[PDB]
Amino acid sequence: MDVLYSLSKTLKDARDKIVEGTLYSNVSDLIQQFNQMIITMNGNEFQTGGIGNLPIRNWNFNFGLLGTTLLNLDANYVETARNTIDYFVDFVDNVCMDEMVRESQRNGIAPQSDSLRKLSAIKFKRINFDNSS
Amino acid sequence: MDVLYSLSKTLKDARDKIVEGTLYSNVSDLIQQFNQMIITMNGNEFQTGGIGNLPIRNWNFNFGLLGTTLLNLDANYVETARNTIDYFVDFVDNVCMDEMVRESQRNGIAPQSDSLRKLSAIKFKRINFDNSS
Amino acid sequence: MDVLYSLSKTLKDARDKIVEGTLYSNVSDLIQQFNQMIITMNGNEFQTGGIGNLPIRNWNFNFGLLGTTLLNLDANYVETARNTIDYFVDFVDNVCMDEMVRESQRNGIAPQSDSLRKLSAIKFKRINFDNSS
Amino acid sequence: HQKEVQYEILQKTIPTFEPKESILKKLEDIKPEQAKKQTKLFRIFEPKQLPIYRANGERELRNRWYWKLKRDTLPDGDYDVREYFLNLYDQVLMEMPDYLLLKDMAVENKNSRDAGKVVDSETAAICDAIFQDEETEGAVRRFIAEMRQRVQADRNVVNYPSILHPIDHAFNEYFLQHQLVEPLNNDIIFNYIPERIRNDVNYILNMDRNLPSTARYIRPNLLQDRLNLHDNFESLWDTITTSNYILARSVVPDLKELVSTEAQIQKMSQDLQLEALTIQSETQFLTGINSQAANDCFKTLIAAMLSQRTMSLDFVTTNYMSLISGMWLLTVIPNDMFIRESLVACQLAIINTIVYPAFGMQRMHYRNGDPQTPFQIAEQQIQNFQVANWLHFVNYNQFRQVVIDGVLNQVLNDNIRNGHVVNQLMEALMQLSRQQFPTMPVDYKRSIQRGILLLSNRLGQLVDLTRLLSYNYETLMACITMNMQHVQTLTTEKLQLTSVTSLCMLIGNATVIPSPQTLFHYYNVNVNFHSNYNERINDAVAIITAANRLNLYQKKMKSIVEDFLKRLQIFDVARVPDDQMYRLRDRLRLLPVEIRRLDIFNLIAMNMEQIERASDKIAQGVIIAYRDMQLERDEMYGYVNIARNLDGFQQINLEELMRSGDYAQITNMLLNNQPVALVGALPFITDSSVISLIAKLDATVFAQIVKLRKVDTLKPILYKINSDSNDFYLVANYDWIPTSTTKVYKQVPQQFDFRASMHMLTSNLTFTVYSDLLAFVSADTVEPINAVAFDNMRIMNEL
């Protein structure tokens, strides 16, 4: 739950700060967060949906790290990062719709979907980012 | 007045950014601000309240610096910082209630409480942080 | 258009973060953006206004870089930066009023003023900053 | 003899030095860094007089002061120019000071009305020439006889005036504000010794020296890993653990007051008879040495566990006395420490001829593959309480992974930290010393049942031996700084079980503990290597990051990594394989840069353009418009064809033209007379002649490009004509406007402003920097007969 907010915070900032022509020192600490997302998420596999007419999708993460060697970001560096952000932002939509749709009566404050129960391990806790909302 | 906002800005960010499992480079510039709060505030002593039914409390600051040597923050590093934040955030409540309750007729734009007059020295000006509200 | 937002974002942050007495590590990445604004903008010249009663003004940029060598910012460093910000913030007002006043019927999504057409070159794309609004 | 050939192929890919015991000198020569202190102010520019000319005229009777780059060693070509700023960047890195004291530099002002001083020797030579010449204004000449220092003996803050360029002040204010030196007291030294020694009763420590407010030090970097060396750098982690092995071997204490081996071999040779059936009959006994096996096993077991270097077992499976004493080796020391293939071969040899025979069971076959060790199979196979209590400890006997203070270390149970597990090894070994051993010949049966009672009758001396072994391992691991990462080492330090039988049958009741002069020395050479390891990473990730932002694509970063591993001083760098040489490279360029080494790269990269354009060797481009543009006026050069921007011309990069090789446009634009601006960093030629200007010289030097197909010989002319260096009368006497075809793109200098180039620098008065913090610590030790372990109960209860 705390790591589901931390996935969405640094995908929002990745579409805002990684723009064409910007200086590298503006994004020098976001890329260290975004590379450290990817290392934690590789090799895992997930499954969302199944209730109602919500379709079943399978998720699989095998991506490469971002480069940390430019002075000003160019259009190669932006377009190779947009096709990684667009796969994560599709994953977070289907986890959030899987959780808003389920409910329990004994302890409703616990996660109910299969994907959000799996994200609550100590393996995934290093993705944690600031909690400012 | 400018340093009263600067105390509250980096206590709000300290509860949001210093979380368990986060990378150290996310909080590498906040800790340099938070350690430099503590160095300025040690050795001083304050007194709030006294008007109406607002009780009189005495404040005294003798704290130690935070560590700057981890790669990912752990539960020792969070729990040793929460028992420092919780003393400052209790101090700022009683200075803000001491100032909203007092008033003057000659020059009302000046600070009126005893603690906020003492924070307006040039000794305390190094706590100043961004003014974005 | 994207670089007109990027001029206003780092002039808003320059009046907020460059304050007296603050630590240098709080503003260590803004000054690298603000110096890199100035290098791109020097030598150019602009012209705004002309329609209605909006007066014609000519703009010319010849400024010097900011210092990157203090530990805490002092009143010399603030007052030498305020007389550079106040010329840029007067320039952005007269470009924004020049664009809100003009319109076209063929393709209205393109820039219409003379200054905003000139800012849409690839020379000015390195001023680009985060797009978070 | 293939065995020495196949081992040598594996050895050539490992950077361990070949005399193995020469590594100990290389670790003890790593010194902590000396605190630097400079004696000059880091000046790049200097003010120099220079003649000026009038509009359409000659030299007037005065001069001007300009800012000139001293020592112009700027090369040509855009690749070589910004490669010169990488050697300048490293020249700032190796000579930045750790601290500054401005009183040691101050020189007396000779023009001052009262006793006034300036900051060093050159700012007194500059301000004296300002005082003399007839051009400076009255408010400046009156001032430099009245500017004052402020000493302020208390609080240790001084102020001295200085005359510096704005670039040169930027490097000097960064050195004054940001310096590594911080105050020392008795509290920091008390929080510097490790935690077990802070809270031990066997060691006595206090402070016997005052430390003033003047005393200082610097904090050596003590950060962890950053780049993982323990997962994929298999050949590179082997030579790390063999260097901690040789260090920890020379720190453990010697044994004391052993059993006399002449009366010990005598009891052993008669308790088991040596005429039964055996073929060795004297090759069984090699345990007669005491200071060379029992000493050299006690050093082997502790130093291999402090260094986390794996062990392998050497034995002869017909010798059972060497095999009974291996039952004590496995019940005390965890089975992670051994090679799996050598662990099983020693476990199966205990069981084949001892465990199963002890109960008449059939000997087992292992089919070398399972996750189950032979102790793990023989455990649910035997229903005996006394033995299976012991077989259950010995296989789930392993380390425990948990941190103290930021250091992950490997520790063991309670029952090995006292000698309590040996009370079960007694019972289990004693239990089978009565097993009637069915089908066994009674000759060989009585020799092996009595050989076990050689060991089971020594209960009180082995309970105290594992009580001492655990304490010396516990005390010496307080002085570890890196993590105790556990992984199977490629090569292996070898153990002989003859040395274990020599340890078991010869120990006395004498307690040995590490003295504090040995505990402190072992702590110093762990911090000195660990601080060296972090300062070299932060030097290597800075040059890789600098040469990438600076666009040096021919840099070949393998030479940075080869210079990286030389300065750790434990590597034979010519033996490291090529995949780990490249995997180490792409882990360096994914690390953030230290902010001290990053605040200076920004400080140089924002000033590259100004240093380059005051050079007096290079001009950064030409234009050619094939039309008679006129000759510019200048108070520096007289008449000059100087250019100040590149507007309306095609900019053609000379470097990208050089690298591509295909010209195809420079040929066309030159044959058919096209206007063009060649952006580069060429060197130029000055020219003072009107006859050489009329003769159209400047347009005749570009046909070299199309024939030679090279750019490196490009060299245009700068017309500097005036009324004193040549025969000027063609300009002055006739009516003609001076025109030319080409311009040489070049910047004019800036002149000396006094108010913009005088500052007031602030530092400390005096202090002292102390390295080697542990010399302020007095260290004593309780008498070794009274020494106790963690439970406040005395070790060596055998007395």
PDB file of C-alpha atoms in Angstrom, chain D residues 414-562:
ATOM      1  CA  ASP D 414      25.425 -19.904  22.851  1.00  0.00           C
ATOM      2  CA  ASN D 415      26.448 -23.540  23.352  1.00  0.00           C
ATOM      3  CA  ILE D 416      29.756 -23.010  21.501  1.00  0.00           C
ATOM      4  CA  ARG D 417      30.347 -19.666  23.210  1.00  0.00           C
ATOM      5  CA  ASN D 418      30.487 -21.665  26.400  1.00  0.00           C
ATOM      6  CA  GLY D 419      31.749 -25.209  26.339  1.00  0.00           C
ATOM      7  CA  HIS D 420      28.359 -26.764  26.872  1.00  0.00           C
ATOM      8  CA  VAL D 421      28.005 -28.616  23.561  1.00  0.00           C
ATOM      9  CA  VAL D 422      31.148 -30.633  24.387  1.00  0.00           C
ATOM     10  CA  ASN D 423      29.134 -32.208  27.221  1.00  0.00           C
ATOM     11  CA  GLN D 424      27.078 -33.912  24.492  1.00  0.00           C
ATOM     12  CA  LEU D 425      30.082 -34.882  22.345  1.00  0.00           C
ATOM     13  CA  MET D 426      31.340 -36.679  25.465  1.00  0.00           C
ATOM     14  CA  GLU D 427      28.142 -38.704  26.040  1.00  0.00           C
ATOM     15  CA  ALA D 428      27.726 -39.581  22.314  1.00  0.00           C
ATOM     16  CA  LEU D 429      31.405 -40.633  21.847  1.00  0.00           C
ATOM     17  CA  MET D 430      31.358 -42.465  25.256  1.00  0.00           C
ATOM     18  CA  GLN D 431      28.003 -44.155  24.371  1.00  0.00           C
ATOM     19  CA  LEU D 432      29.538 -45.960  21.383  1.00  0.00           C
ATOM     20  CA  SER D 433      32.724 -46.742  23.270  1.00  0.00           C
ATOM     21  CA  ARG D 434      30.609 -49.782  24.387  1.00  0.00           C
ATOM     22  CA  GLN D 435      29.092 -51.069  21.128  1.00  0.00           C
ATOM     23  CA  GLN D 436      30.469 -54.621  20.997  1.00  0.00           C
ATOM     24  CA  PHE D 437      30.854 -53.785  17.214  1.00  0.00           C
ATOM     25  CA  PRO D 438      29.384 -56.904  15.533  1.00  0.00           C
ATOM     26  CA  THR D 439      31.413 -58.645  12.742  1.00  0.00           C
ATOM     27  CA  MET D 440      34.475 -56.542  13.758  1.00  0.00           C
ATOM     28  CA  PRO D 441      37.698 -58.372  14.677  1.00  0.00           C
ATOM     29  CA  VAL D 442      38.346 -57.932  18.394  1.00  0.00           C
ATOM     30  CA  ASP D 443      41.964 -56.905  17.712  1.00  0.00           C
ATOM     31  CA  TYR D 444      40.897 -53.860  15.692  1.00  0.00           C
ATOM     32  CA  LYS D 445      37.817 -53.382  17.899  1.00  0.00           C
ATOM     33  CA  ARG D 446      39.769 -52.786  21.105  1.00  0.00           C
ATOM     34  CA  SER D 447      42.171 -50.420  19.363  1.00  0.00           C
ATOM     35  CA  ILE D 448      39.341 -48.153  18.233  1.00  0.00           C
ATOM     36  CA  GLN D 449      37.279 -48.274  21.442  1.00  0.00           C
ATOM     37  CA  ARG D 450      40.338 -47.210  23.441  1.00  0.00           C
ATOM     38  CA  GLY D 451      41.214 -44.493  20.933  1.00  0.00           C
ATOM     39  CA  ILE D 452      37.877 -42.833  21.629  1.00  0.00           C
ATOM     40  CA  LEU D 453      38.545 -42.813  25.368  1.00  0.00           C
ATOM     41  CA  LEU D 454      41.738 -40.902  24.593  1.00  0.00           C
ATOM     42  CA  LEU D 455      39.344 -38.034  23.807  1.00  0.00           C
ATOM     43  CA  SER D 456      36.255 -38.608  25.981  1.00  0.00           C
ATOM     44  CA  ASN D 457      38.397 -38.630  29.133  1.00  0.00           C
ATOM     45  CA  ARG D 458      39.531 -35.070  28.323  1.00  0.00           C
ATOM     46  CA  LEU D 459      36.164 -33.412  28.893  1.00  0.00           C
ATOM     47  CA  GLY D 460      37.226 -30.561  31.162  1.00  0.00           C
ATOM     48  CA  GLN D 461      40.071 -29.554  28.846  1.00  0.00           C
ATOM     49  CA  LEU D 462      37.981 -29.397  25.655  1.00  0.00           C
ATOM     50  CA  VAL D 463      35.080 -27.573  27.313  1.00  0.00           C
ATOM     51  CA  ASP D 464      37.596 -24.848  28.149  1.00  0.00           C
ATOM     52  CA  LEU D 465      39.348 -24.984  24.766  1.00  0.00           C
ATOM     53  CA  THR D 466      36.191 -24.148  22.826  1.00  0.00           C
ATOM     54  CA  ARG D 467      35.505 -21.594  25.561  1.00  0.00           C
ATOM     55  CA  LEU D 468      38.772 -19.833  24.645  1.00  0.00           C
ATOM     56  CA  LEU D 469      38.411 -20.250  20.867  1.00  0.00           C
ATOM     57  CA  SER D 470      35.049 -18.499  20.902  1.00  0.00           C
ATOM     58  CA  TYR D 471      36.357 -15.591  22.975  1.00  0.00           C
ATOM     59  CA  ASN D 472      39.334 -14.831  20.727  1.00  0.00           C
ATOM     60  CA  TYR D 473      37.004 -14.923  17.732  1.00  0.00           C
ATOM     61  CA  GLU D 474      34.537 -12.687  19.559  1.00  0.00           C
ATOM     62  CA  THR D 475      37.066 -10.081  20.701  1.00  0.00           C
ATOM     63  CA  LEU D 476      38.893  -9.704  17.384  1.00  0.00           C
ATOM     64  CA  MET D 477      35.719  -9.226  15.326  1.00  0.00           C
ATOM     65  CA  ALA D 478      34.960  -5.978  17.133  1.00  0.00           C
ATOM     66  CA  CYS D 479      37.626  -4.371  14.929  1.00  0.00           C
ATOM     67  CA  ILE D 480      35.957  -5.270  11.609  1.00  0.00           C
ATOM     68  CA  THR D 481      34.677  -2.437   9.426  1.00  0.00           C
ATOM     69  CA  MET D 482      33.520  -4.065   6.178  1.00  0.00           C
ATOM     70  CA  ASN D 483      30.652  -6.539   6.092  1.00  0.00           C
ATOM     71  CA  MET D 484      31.322 -10.206   6.750  1.00  0.00           C
ATOM     72  CA  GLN D 485      29.844 -11.316   3.453  1.00  0.00           C
ATOM     73  CA  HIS D 486      29.725 -15.096   3.100  1.00  0.00           C
ATOM     74  CA  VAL D 487      30.298 -16.770  -0.274  1.00  0.00           C
ATOM     75  CA  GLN D 488      32.249 -19.826  -1.432  1.00  0.00           C
ATOM     76  CA  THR D 489      35.801 -18.798  -2.304  1.00  0.00           C
ATOM     77  CA  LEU D 490      37.293 -20.003  -5.601  1.00  0.00           C
ATOM     78  CA  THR D 491      40.524 -21.303  -4.060  1.00  0.00           C
ATOM     79  CA  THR D 492      40.759 -22.689  -0.553  1.00  0.00           C
ATOM     80  CA  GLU D 493      43.065 -22.582   2.459  1.00  0.00           C
ATOM     81  CA  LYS D 494      43.825 -26.179   3.409  1.00  0.00           C
ATOM     82  CA  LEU D 495      43.415 -27.859   6.805  1.00  0.00           C
ATOM     83  CA  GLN D 496      45.117 -31.052   7.953  1.00  0.00           C
ATOM     84  CA  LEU D 497      43.388 -33.107  10.625  1.00  0.00           C
ATOM     85  CA  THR D 498      46.798 -34.046  12.025  1.00  0.00           C
ATOM     86  CA  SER D 499      46.883 -30.466  13.329  1.00  0.00           C
ATOM     87  CA  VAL D 500      43.535 -30.931  15.082  1.00  0.00           C
ATOM     88  CA  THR D 501      44.645 -34.065  16.949  1.00  0.00           C
ATOM     89  CA  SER D 502      47.737 -32.095  17.936  1.00  0.00           C
ATOM     90  CA  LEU D 503      45.482 -29.322  19.257  1.00  0.00           C
ATOM     91  CA  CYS D 504      43.134 -31.601  21.200  1.00  0.00           C
ATOM     92  CA  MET D 505      45.715 -33.745  22.982  1.00  0.00           C
ATOM     93  CA  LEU D 506      48.174 -30.980  23.915  1.00  0.00           C
ATOM     94  CA  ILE D 507      46.209 -28.021  25.322  1.00  0.00           C
ATOM     95  CA  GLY D 508      46.739 -26.899  28.925  1.00  0.00           C
ATOM     96  CA  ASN D 509      44.813 -24.492  31.170  1.00  0.00           C
ATOM     97  CA  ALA D 510      46.590 -21.255  30.218  1.00  0.00           C
ATOM     98  CA  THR D 511      44.507 -18.311  29.023  1.00  0.00           C
ATOM     99  CA  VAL D 512      45.732 -16.141  26.156  1.00  0.00           C
ATOM    100  CA  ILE D 513      43.865 -12.983  25.113  1.00  0.00           C
ATOM    101  CA  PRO D 514      44.762 -10.232  22.627  1.00  0.00           C
ATOM    102  CA  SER D 515      46.603  -7.344  24.238  1.00  0.00           C
ATOM    103  CA  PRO D 516      45.148  -3.867  23.533  1.00  0.00           C
ATOM    104  CA  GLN D 517      48.234  -2.785  21.600  1.00  0.00           C
ATOM    105  CA  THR D 518      47.340  -5.648  19.234  1.00  0.00           C
ATOM    106  CA  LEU D 519      43.615  -4.857  19.350  1.00  0.00           C
ATOM    107  CA  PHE D 520      44.293  -1.251  18.401  1.00  0.00           C
ATOM    108  CA  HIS D 521      46.757  -2.103  15.616  1.00  0.00           C
ATOM    109  CA  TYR D 522      44.272  -4.543  14.091  1.00  0.00           C
ATOM    110  CA  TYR D 523      41.646  -1.809  14.253  1.00  0.00           C
ATOM    111  CA  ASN D 524      43.874   0.797  12.579  1.00  0.00           C
ATOM    112  CA  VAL D 525      44.785  -1.310   9.539  1.00  0.00           C
ATOM    113  CA  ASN D 526      41.123  -2.159   8.996  1.00  0.00           C
ATOM    114  CA  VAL D 527      40.101   1.508   8.953  1.00  0.00           C
ATOM    115  CA  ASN D 528      43.090   2.516   6.808  1.00  0.00           C
ATOM    116  CA  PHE D 529      42.204   0.009   4.095  1.00  0.00           C
ATOM    117  CA  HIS D 530      38.491   0.800   4.311  1.00  0.00           C
ATOM    118  CA  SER D 531      39.044   4.543   3.963  1.00  0.00           C
ATOM    119  CA  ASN D 532      41.445   3.958   1.065  1.00  0.00           C
ATOM    120  CA  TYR D 533      38.749   1.848  -0.601  1.00  0.00           C
ATOM    121  CA  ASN D 534      36.172   4.654  -0.519  1.00  0.00           C
ATOM    122  CA  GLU D 535      38.484   7.495  -1.522  1.00  0.00           C
ATOM    123  CA  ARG D 536      39.567   5.660  -4.668  1.00  0.00           C
ATOM    124  CA  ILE D 537      35.983   4.970  -5.767  1.00  0.00           C
ATOM    125  CA  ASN D 538      35.103   8.645  -5.422  1.00  0.00           C
ATOM    126  CA  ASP D 539      38.182   9.532  -7.490  1.00  0.00           C
ATOM    127  CA  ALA D 540      37.337   7.039 -10.236  1.00  0.00           C
ATOM    128  CA  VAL D 541      33.641   7.900 -10.569  1.00  0.00           C
ATOM    129  CA  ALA D 542      34.602  11.571 -10.876  1.00  0.00           C
ATOM    130  CA  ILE D 543      37.003  11.225 -13.811  1.00  0.00           C
ATOM    131  CA  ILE D 544      34.579   8.913 -15.634  1.00  0.00           C
ATOM    132  CA  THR D 545      31.767  11.429 -15.099  1.00  0.00           C
ATOM    133  CA  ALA D 546      33.952  14.412 -16.045  1.00  0.00           C
ATOM    134  CA  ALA D 547      35.280  12.878 -19.275  1.00  0.00           C
ATOM    135  CA  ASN D 548      31.724  11.991 -20.340  1.00  0.00           C
ATOM    136  CA  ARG D 549      30.140  15.405 -19.787  1.00  0.00           C
ATOM    137  CA  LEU D 550      33.266  16.949 -21.415  1.00  0.00           C
ATOM    138  CA  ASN D 551      32.637  14.823 -24.572  1.00  0.00           C
ATOM    139  CA  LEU D 552      35.797  12.716 -24.700  1.00  0.00           C
ATOM    140  CA  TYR D 553      34.671   9.666 -26.627  1.00  0.00           C
ATOM    141  CA  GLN D 554      38.227   8.399 -27.241  1.00  0.00           C
ATOM    142  CA  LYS D 555      38.953   8.245 -23.518  1.00  0.00           C
ATOM    143  CA  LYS D 556      38.919   4.408 -23.179  1.00  0.00           C
ATOM    144  CA  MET D 557      37.839   4.047 -19.542  1.00  0.00           C
ATOM    145  CA  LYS D 558      39.669   0.723 -19.089  1.00  0.00           C
ATOM    146  CA  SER D 559      42.794   2.701 -18.156  1.00  0.00           C
ATOM    147  CA  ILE D 560      40.863   4.373 -15.329  1.00  0.00           C
ATOM    148  CA  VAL D 561      39.908   0.965 -13.928  1.00  0.00           C
ATOM    149  CA  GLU D 562      43.479  -0.325 -14.246  1.00  0.00           C
TER     150      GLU D 562
END
